[PDB]
Amino acid sequence: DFSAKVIQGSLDSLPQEVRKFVEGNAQLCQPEYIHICDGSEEEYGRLLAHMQEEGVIRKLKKYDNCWLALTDPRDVARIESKTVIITQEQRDTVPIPKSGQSQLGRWMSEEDFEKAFNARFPGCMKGRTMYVIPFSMGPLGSPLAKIGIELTDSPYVVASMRIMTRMGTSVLEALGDGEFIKCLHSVGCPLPLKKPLVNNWACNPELTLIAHLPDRREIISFGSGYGGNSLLGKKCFALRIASRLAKEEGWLAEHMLILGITNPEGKKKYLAAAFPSACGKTNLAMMNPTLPGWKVECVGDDIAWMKFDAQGNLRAINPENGFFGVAPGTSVKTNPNAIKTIQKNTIFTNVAETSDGGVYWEGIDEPLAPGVTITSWKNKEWRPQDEEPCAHPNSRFCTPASQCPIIDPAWESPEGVPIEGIIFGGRRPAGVPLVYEALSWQHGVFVGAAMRSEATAAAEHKGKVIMHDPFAMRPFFGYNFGKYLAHWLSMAHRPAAKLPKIFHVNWFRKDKNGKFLWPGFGENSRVLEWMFGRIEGEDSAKLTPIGYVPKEDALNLKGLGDVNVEELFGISKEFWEKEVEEIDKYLEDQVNADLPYEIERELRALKQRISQM
Numbered sequence: 001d002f003s004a005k006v007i008q009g010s011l012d013s014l015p016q017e018v019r020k021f022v023e024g025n026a027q028l029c030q031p032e033y034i035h036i037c038d039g040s041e042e043e044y045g046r047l048l049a050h051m052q053e054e055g056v057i058r059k060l061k062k063y064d065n066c067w068l069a070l071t072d073p074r075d076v077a078r079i080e081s082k083t084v085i086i087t088q089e090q091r092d093t094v095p096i097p098k099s100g101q102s103q104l105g106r107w108m109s110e111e112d113f114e115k116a117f118n119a120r121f122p123g124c125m126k127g128r129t130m131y132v133i134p135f136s137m138g139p140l141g142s143p144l145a146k147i148g149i150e151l152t153d154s155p156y157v158v159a160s161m162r163i164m165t166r167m168g169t170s171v172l173e174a175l176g177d178g179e180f181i182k183c184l185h186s187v188g189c190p191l192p193l194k195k196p197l198v199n200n201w202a203c204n205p206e207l208t209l210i211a212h213l214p215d216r217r218e219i220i221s222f223g224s225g226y227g228g229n230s231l232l233g234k235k236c237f238a239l240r241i242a243s244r245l246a247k248e249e250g251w252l253a254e255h256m257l258i259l260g261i262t263n264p265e266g267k268k269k270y271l272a273a274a275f276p277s278a279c280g281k282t283n284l285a286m287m288n289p290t291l292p293g294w295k296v297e298c299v300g301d302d303i304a305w306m307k308f309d310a311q312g313n314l315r316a317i318n319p320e321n322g323f324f325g326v327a328p329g330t331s332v333k334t335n336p337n338a339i340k341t342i343q344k345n346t347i348f349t350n351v352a353e354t355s356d357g358g359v360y361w362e363g364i365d366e367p368l369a370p371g372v373t374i375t376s377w378k379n380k381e382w383r384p385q386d387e388e389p390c391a392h393p394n395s396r397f398c399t400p401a402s403q404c405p406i407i408d409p410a411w412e413s414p415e416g417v418p419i420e421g422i423i424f425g426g427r428r429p430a431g432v433p434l435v436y437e438a439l440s441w442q443h444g445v446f447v448g449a450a451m452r453s454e455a456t457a458a459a460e461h462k463g464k465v466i467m468h469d470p471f472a473m474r475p476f477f478g479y480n481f482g483k484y485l486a487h488w489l490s491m492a493h494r495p496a497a498k499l500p501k502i503f504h505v506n507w508f509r510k511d512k513n514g515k516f517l518w519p520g521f522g523e524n525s526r527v528l529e530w531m532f533g534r535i536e537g538e539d540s541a542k543l544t545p546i547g548y549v550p551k552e553d554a555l556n557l558k559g560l561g562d563v564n565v566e567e568l569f570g571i572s573k574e575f576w577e578k579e580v581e582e583i584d585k586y587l588e589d590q591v592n593a594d595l596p597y598e599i600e601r602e603l604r605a606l607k608q609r610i611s612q613m
């Protein structure tokens with residue numbers, strides 16, 4: 001009985017199964033105190049002020065209620081190699097790769113995990129408060145919403161979860177005696193500290209392990225206080241666990257933005273887009289269109305939960321309550337709506353700070369007044385000419401979604417929004433045209449499966465080498481990728497299903513000396529215009545070996561000067577021969593026995609179309 005240690009709420013007021021979860025882990029982790037979060041403004045402000053007292057965060061004086069955390073440099077992003085899923089059989093979690101090293105997930109046996117667990121969690125919260133975070137993924141009363149309980153010894157986690165999820169007492173009241181996903185987190189630094197504290201950021205890099213136990217409905221994360229590792233509702237729950245549930249239950253959990261777009265004829269359509277981490281999702285989702293009479297509104301920027309309704313419409317909700325966006329590159333010119341969103345009530349991690357108490361990062365495009373100096377993310381003085389960046393490449397803002405000036409009026413509608421198009425894309429410097437359209441659902445699933453993109457700073461992958469990232473979900477598959485492909489393909493045999501048109505984009509094609517062929521950002525509205533017309537049934541497409549592309553003059557290029565058109569839209573036989581062979585060998589190695597017949601067929605079909613050019 002840990003009742004005596006509860007400093008907010010009551011164990012008696014908790015639902016039966018919630019009490020057992022809290023108490024069992026209190027027995028194991030040995031916290032000094034238990035704080036059951038209520039999600040109130042008062043709780044939030046006081047916790048922020050306490051972190052400020054302890055030197056864990058700094059207040060940003062230029063803004064209304066904004067804060068800055070600077071981490072231990074060993075804890076700065078997701079670590080895919082220390083992120084594991086436990087199942088009875090390895091093949092349920094990843095396909096068995098021919099080469100013996102899977103690039104589609106990482107499995108750990110039940111036995112190996114139990115040993116890892118016992119080596120980490122006993123006593124891990126000694127001298128700390130265990131915070132109990134009741135959270136809902138998805139709008140208030142959405143039939144698509146799922147609730148979790150996260151236990152953590154990090155106030156930083158509590159604060160960020162308030163922004164990124166719906167959290168507090170009303171969630172507990174909604175849960176009742178229902179099921180919840182069990183999320184356990186520790187920074188892994190019990191008191192007294194056995195190792196030095198670096199930058200007042202508690203973490204345990206050597207023992208970092210982010211584990212998922214779908215058959216137990218548990219997420220268990222140790223050693224990292226950073227975003228994707230510690231905010232367990234986001235990647236761990238809403239993608240890894242949820243994708244598996246989605247498979248089981250007939251829906252989809254995807255690494256997708258959702259946006260609403262209205263044309264000059266007063267018609268609105270919703271689109272979803274899957275681009276890899278740090279490949280343009282947030283920027284597209286809250287785009288400021290350059291084309292007159294067009295408007296974009298943001299439903300979500302990162303995760304989509306989608307389910308076909310009784311009428312056959314693919315209805316989507318954003319399960320998150322905030323944006324956890326990449327900071328560097330964000331500017332008034334590139335993402336004006338993000339800049340407006342983050343002006344108040346926002347937590348920044350690993351960005352720079354100006355002497356005026358403002359935020360700073362690479363690509364902010366914000367000349368500072370003479371005399372204003374910069375403190376880098378490492379808490380050292382920094383000059384514009386210096387070798388290293390002022391902000392970490394994976395620095396983040398964590399901001400309430402309700403503050404986006406173009407948040408969609410239906411972004412919290414319980415039934416969700418009807419998706420009419422799904423867009424795939426990544427960073428490809430060569431060979432891949434600005435936009436093309438899949439020939440069929442099956443072709444579209446292949447296009448998703450074949451996605452490749454330059455590495456980014458979102459995880460541990462350095463350099464810019466082109467990596468396979470199918471459906472932008474390589475770090476996030478909750479189960480066997482072959483079975484995931486099967487699941488997607490099965491949607492075509494569901495009665496009444498209105499299958500969205502599928503497109504592939506490339507914002508990132510570079511010419512022969514390394515400059516972008518396409519301006520992008522707000523100009524991407526010209527591509528969305530084309531997609532919108534295609535959904536409407538417009539005669540605006542020409543057939544090519546890779547799919548449909550815009551006809552001559554179909555794309556609105558007015559005001560864009562002499563854009564190098566057939567360099568941007570060029571399709572080389574030699575490039576695509578190479579491409580298809582590479583896709584072939586990848587799928588054979590990585591997916592093997594679990595590759596759906598229909599994907600192999602699309603591969604064969606593409607190879608044949610290419611062979612005839």
Ligand SMILES: Nc1nc2c(ncn2[C@@H]2O[C@H](COP(=O)(O)OP(=O)(O)O)[C@@H](O)[C@H]2O)c(=O)[nH]1
Pocket residue numbers: 275276277278279280281282283284301325326327328329330334507516519520521524
């Ligand atoms: N050149 C170019 N860069 C972009 C575009 N969209 C986003 N970016 C940059 O890519 C980085 C990550 O963008 P973001 O929208 O946050 O991607 P996300 O992590 O998938 O949400 C930022 O530095 C952006 O400025 C684009 O259309 N063109």
Ligand SMILES: O=C([O-])CC(=O)C(=O)O
Pocket residue numbers: 077078227228229234235277278302324458459
């Ligand atoms: O790690 C996170 O939570 C941020 C994110 O959305 C990504 O890196 O894809």
Ligand SMILES: [Mn+2]
Pocket residue numbers: 255277278302
């Ligand atoms: Mn993401």
Ligand SMILES: [Mn+2]
Pocket residue numbers: 278281282283324325326
């Ligand atoms: Mn982003």
Ligand SMILES: [Mn+2]
Pocket residue numbers: 489492493598
């Ligand atoms: Mn079929």
Ligand code: NA
Pocket residue numbers: 055056057069070071072199200201
């Ligand atoms: Na710090």
